[PDB]
Nucleic acid binder design. Sequence first.
DNA 1: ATCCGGTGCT
DNA 2: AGCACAGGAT
Length: 222
Amino acid sequence: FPAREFQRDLLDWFARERRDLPWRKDRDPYKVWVSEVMLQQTRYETVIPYFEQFIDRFPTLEALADADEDEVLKAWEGLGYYSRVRNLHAAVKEVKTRYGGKVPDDPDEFSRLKGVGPYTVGAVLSLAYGVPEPAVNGNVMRVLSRLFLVTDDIAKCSTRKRFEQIVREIMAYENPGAFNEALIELGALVCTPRRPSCLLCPVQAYCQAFAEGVAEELPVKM
DNA sequence: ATCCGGTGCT
DNA sequence: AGCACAGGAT
Ligand code: SF4
Ligand SMILES: [Ca+2]
Ligand SMILES: [Ca+2]
Protein backbone atom coordinates (compact mmCIF):
# COMPACT_ATOMS: atom_id res chain seq x y z
CA PHE A 1 0.00 0.00 0.00
CA PRO A 2 1.40 3.39 -1.08
CA ALA A 3 1.18 4.92 2.41
CA ARG A 4 3.40 7.92 1.68
CA GLU A 5 1.40 9.03 -1.38
CA PHE A 6 -1.91 8.42 0.42
CA GLN A 7 -0.79 10.64 3.33
CA ARG A 8 0.29 13.33 0.90
CA ASP A 9 -3.03 13.43 -0.92
CA LEU A 10 -5.07 13.22 2.31
CA LEU A 11 -3.08 15.89 4.16
CA ASP A 12 -2.86 18.21 1.13
CA TRP A 13 -6.65 17.97 1.01
CA PHE A 14 -7.04 18.53 4.74
CA ALA A 15 -4.78 21.64 4.66
CA ARG A 16 -7.19 23.12 2.10
CA GLU A 17 -10.51 22.14 3.66
CA ARG A 18 -9.91 21.93 7.43
CA ARG A 19 -12.79 23.70 9.17
CA ASP A 20 -11.83 26.25 11.85
CA LEU A 21 -14.28 24.90 14.41
CA PRO A 22 -14.09 26.35 17.95
CA TRP A 23 -12.45 23.26 19.47
CA ARG A 24 -9.66 23.64 16.90
CA LYS A 25 -8.55 27.02 18.31
CA ASP A 26 -5.79 25.43 20.37
CA ARG A 27 -4.40 22.03 21.32
CA ASP A 28 -5.49 22.14 24.99
CA PRO A 29 -6.05 18.48 25.96
CA TYR A 30 -8.86 19.56 28.28
CA LYS A 31 -10.70 21.52 25.59
CA VAL A 32 -10.12 18.74 23.04
CA TRP A 33 -11.46 16.18 25.53
CA VAL A 34 -14.60 18.21 26.22
CA SER A 35 -15.32 18.63 22.50
CA GLU A 36 -14.88 14.88 21.89
CA VAL A 37 -17.37 13.96 24.65
CA MET A 38 -19.88 16.50 23.27
CA LEU A 39 -19.42 15.39 19.64
CA GLN A 40 -19.83 11.67 20.38
CA GLN A 41 -23.52 12.24 21.04
CA THR A 42 -24.53 15.40 19.15
CA ARG A 43 -24.08 17.04 15.73
CA TYR A 44 -21.41 19.73 15.51
CA GLU A 45 -23.83 22.53 14.58
CA THR A 46 -25.51 22.04 17.97
CA VAL A 47 -22.22 21.47 19.81
CA ILE A 48 -20.77 24.83 18.78
CA PRO A 49 -22.78 27.07 21.18
CA TYR A 50 -22.63 24.54 24.03
CA PHE A 51 -18.88 24.19 23.73
CA GLU A 52 -18.20 27.91 23.76
CA GLN A 53 -20.43 28.47 26.79
CA PHE A 54 -19.16 25.39 28.65
CA ILE A 55 -15.52 26.47 28.30
CA ASP A 56 -16.46 30.05 29.21
CA ARG A 57 -17.98 28.67 32.41
CA PHE A 58 -15.11 26.18 32.83
CA PRO A 59 -11.95 27.69 31.25
CA THR A 60 -9.63 25.05 32.69
CA LEU A 61 -9.74 21.44 33.84
CA GLU A 62 -9.31 22.43 37.53
CA ALA A 63 -12.25 24.80 37.09
CA LEU A 64 -14.38 21.88 35.94
CA ALA A 65 -13.08 19.54 38.66
CA ASP A 66 -13.78 22.18 41.33
CA ALA A 67 -17.35 22.87 40.23
CA ASP A 68 -20.36 21.38 41.98
CA GLU A 69 -22.15 18.72 39.93
CA ASP A 70 -25.35 20.79 39.80
CA GLU A 71 -23.41 23.49 37.99
CA VAL A 72 -21.92 20.98 35.58
CA LEU A 73 -25.32 19.42 34.79
CA LYS A 74 -26.81 22.87 34.18
CA ALA A 75 -24.06 23.69 31.69
CA TRP A 76 -24.82 20.40 29.94
CA GLU A 77 -28.54 21.21 29.82
CA GLY A 78 -29.87 20.43 26.36
CA LEU A 79 -27.16 18.00 25.29
CA GLY A 80 -28.69 15.04 27.12
CA TYR A 81 -26.81 11.89 28.19
CA TYR A 82 -26.29 13.35 31.63
CA SER A 83 -24.43 10.30 32.94
CA ARG A 84 -21.69 10.97 30.36
CA VAL A 85 -20.95 14.42 31.75
CA ARG A 86 -21.04 13.01 35.30
CA ASN A 87 -18.37 10.55 34.15
CA LEU A 88 -16.40 13.38 32.53
CA HIS A 89 -16.69 15.28 35.85
CA ALA A 90 -15.44 12.26 37.77
CA ALA A 91 -12.55 11.79 35.36
CA VAL A 92 -11.32 15.39 35.53
CA LYS A 93 -11.55 15.20 39.34
CA GLU A 94 -9.21 12.22 39.18
CA VAL A 95 -6.91 14.08 36.78
CA LYS A 96 -6.69 16.96 39.29
CA THR A 97 -6.13 14.88 42.41
CA ARG A 98 -3.97 12.15 40.89
CA TYR A 99 -2.28 13.70 37.86
CA GLY A 100 -1.74 17.23 39.18
CA GLY A 101 -4.40 18.67 36.87
CA LYS A 102 -2.64 17.56 33.68
CA VAL A 103 -4.35 15.18 31.27
CA PRO A 104 -2.09 12.10 31.28
CA ASP A 105 -0.15 11.65 28.03
CA ASP A 106 0.30 7.92 28.58
CA PRO A 107 -2.45 5.98 26.75
CA ASP A 108 -2.72 3.29 29.46
CA GLU A 109 -2.98 5.90 32.22
CA PHE A 110 -5.55 8.08 30.39
CA SER A 111 -7.60 5.01 29.56
CA ARG A 112 -8.01 4.12 33.26
CA LEU A 113 -10.35 7.12 33.76
CA LYS A 114 -14.13 6.71 33.87
CA GLY A 115 -15.79 7.06 30.48
CA VAL A 116 -12.51 7.16 28.57
CA GLY A 117 -12.30 4.42 25.94
CA PRO A 118 -10.00 3.65 22.96
CA TYR A 119 -11.34 6.39 20.71
CA THR A 120 -11.23 9.11 23.35
CA VAL A 121 -7.68 8.06 24.26
CA GLY A 122 -6.48 8.24 20.66
CA ALA A 123 -8.28 11.45 19.83
CA VAL A 124 -7.16 13.45 22.84
CA LEU A 125 -3.58 12.21 22.98
CA SER A 126 -2.94 12.47 19.22
CA LEU A 127 -4.70 15.85 18.71
CA ALA A 128 -3.39 17.50 21.89
CA TYR A 129 -0.04 15.78 22.55
CA GLY A 130 0.87 14.32 19.15
CA VAL A 131 1.05 10.77 20.56
CA PRO A 132 0.80 8.48 17.54
CA GLU A 133 -2.25 6.50 18.70
CA PRO A 134 -5.15 5.63 16.36
CA ALA A 135 -8.40 7.49 16.88
CA VAL A 136 -10.96 5.20 15.29
CA ASN A 137 -14.54 6.49 15.57
CA GLY A 138 -17.56 5.81 13.32
CA ASN A 139 -16.31 8.22 10.65
CA VAL A 140 -12.94 6.52 10.52
CA MET A 141 -14.46 3.02 10.45
CA ARG A 142 -16.58 4.10 7.51
CA VAL A 143 -13.56 5.61 5.68
CA LEU A 144 -11.28 2.64 6.35
CA SER A 145 -13.92 -0.02 5.59
CA ARG A 146 -14.29 1.59 2.18
CA LEU A 147 -10.61 2.19 1.39
CA PHE A 148 -9.67 -1.38 2.33
CA LEU A 149 -12.97 -3.18 1.68
CA VAL A 150 -13.41 -4.38 5.27
CA THR A 151 -16.63 -6.41 5.33
CA ASP A 152 -16.48 -7.44 9.00
CA ASP A 153 -19.03 -6.31 11.60
CA ILE A 154 -17.73 -2.97 12.94
CA ALA A 155 -19.42 -3.69 16.32
CA LYS A 156 -16.78 -6.40 17.02
CA CYS A 157 -13.54 -5.80 18.88
CA SER A 158 -11.69 -7.95 16.34
CA THR A 159 -12.85 -5.65 13.53
CA ARG A 160 -11.87 -2.53 15.48
CA LYS A 161 -8.41 -4.00 16.21
CA ARG A 162 -8.00 -4.52 12.48
CA PHE A 163 -8.85 -0.80 11.89
CA GLU A 164 -6.28 0.20 14.54
CA GLN A 165 -3.62 -1.94 12.90
CA ILE A 166 -4.37 -0.38 9.48
CA VAL A 167 -3.98 3.10 11.00
CA ARG A 168 -0.71 2.15 12.76
CA GLU A 169 0.51 0.91 9.35
CA ILE A 170 -0.51 3.93 7.25
CA MET A 171 -0.30 6.80 9.76
CA ALA A 172 1.77 9.90 8.99
CA TYR A 173 4.06 9.71 12.04
CA GLU A 174 5.50 13.19 11.43
CA ASN A 175 2.05 14.51 12.45
CA PRO A 176 -0.29 11.90 13.97
CA GLY A 177 -2.71 14.62 15.08
CA ALA A 178 -3.27 16.08 11.61
CA PHE A 179 -3.46 12.55 10.18
CA ASN A 180 -6.23 11.41 12.54
CA GLU A 181 -8.13 14.68 12.17
CA ALA A 182 -7.97 14.34 8.39
CA LEU A 183 -9.51 10.83 8.43
CA ILE A 184 -12.34 12.09 10.67
CA GLU A 185 -12.87 15.19 8.50
CA LEU A 186 -12.89 13.07 5.34
CA GLY A 187 -15.72 10.96 6.82
CA ALA A 188 -17.55 14.12 7.86
CA LEU A 189 -17.30 16.01 4.59
CA VAL A 190 -16.72 13.60 1.74
CA CYS A 191 -16.90 9.95 2.72
CA THR A 192 -20.38 10.27 4.21
CA PRO A 193 -22.81 7.55 5.40
CA ARG A 194 -25.06 7.86 2.34
CA ARG A 195 -23.92 8.88 -1.15
CA PRO A 196 -20.24 9.62 -0.44
CA SER A 197 -18.70 12.25 -2.71
CA CYS A 198 -16.19 9.95 -4.39
CA LEU A 199 -15.83 12.15 -7.51
CA LEU A 200 -14.32 14.88 -5.30
CA CYS A 201 -12.45 12.56 -2.89
CA PRO A 202 -8.69 13.16 -2.56
CA VAL A 203 -7.99 9.48 -1.92
CA GLN A 204 -10.24 8.04 -4.62
CA ALA A 205 -7.23 6.44 -6.33
CA TYR A 206 -6.57 4.33 -3.24
CA CYS A 207 -10.14 3.30 -2.51
CA GLN A 208 -11.08 -0.36 -3.00
CA ALA A 209 -14.81 0.17 -2.41
CA PHE A 210 -14.97 2.86 -5.09
CA ALA A 211 -13.01 0.65 -7.49
CA GLU A 212 -15.49 -2.13 -6.81
CA GLY A 213 -18.57 0.14 -6.85
CA VAL A 214 -19.73 -0.89 -3.35
CA ALA A 215 -19.07 2.19 -1.16
CA GLU A 216 -22.70 2.58 -0.25
CA GLU A 217 -22.74 -0.94 1.19
CA LEU A 218 -20.06 -0.02 3.76
CA PRO A 219 -19.37 -0.25 6.64
CA VAL A 220 -20.95 -3.55 7.65
CA LYS A 221 -22.98 -3.52 10.86
CA MET A 222 -25.19 -6.31 12.14
C1' DA B 1 -14.72 -9.57 23.65
C1' DT B 2 -18.31 -7.89 23.72
C1' DC B 3 -23.42 -5.57 23.83
C1' DC B 4 -25.52 -1.85 26.38
C1' DG B 5 -28.26 2.60 26.55
C1' DG B 6 -30.03 7.44 25.80
C1' DT B 7 -31.46 9.64 22.12
C1' DG B 8 -33.81 11.08 17.74
C1' DC B 9 -36.51 9.77 14.18
C1' DT B 10 -40.61 7.83 12.28
C1' DA C 1 -44.13 1.36 18.89
C1' DG C 2 -39.53 -0.19 16.43
C1' DC C 3 -35.14 1.03 14.68
C1' DA C 4 -30.32 3.17 14.04
C1' DC C 5 -26.53 5.32 15.92
C1' DA C 6 -21.94 5.38 18.67
C1' DG C 7 -18.90 4.75 21.43
C1' DG C 8 -17.30 2.51 26.21
C1' DA C 9 -18.15 -1.49 28.57
C1' DT C 10 -15.02 -4.79 33.29
S1 SF4 D 1 -13.58 7.28 -2.80
FE1 SF4 D 1 -15.64 7.39 -2.06
S2 SF4 D 1 -15.68 5.65 -0.68
FE2 SF4 D 1 -13.53 5.75 -1.17
S3 SF4 D 1 -12.82 7.00 0.48
FE3 SF4 D 1 -13.25 8.53 -1.04
S4 SF4 D 1 -15.35 8.96 -0.55
FE4 SF4 D 1 -15.00 7.17 0.72
CA1 LIG E 1 -10.82 2.89 29.52
CA1 LIG F 1 -20.61 -12.83 18.15
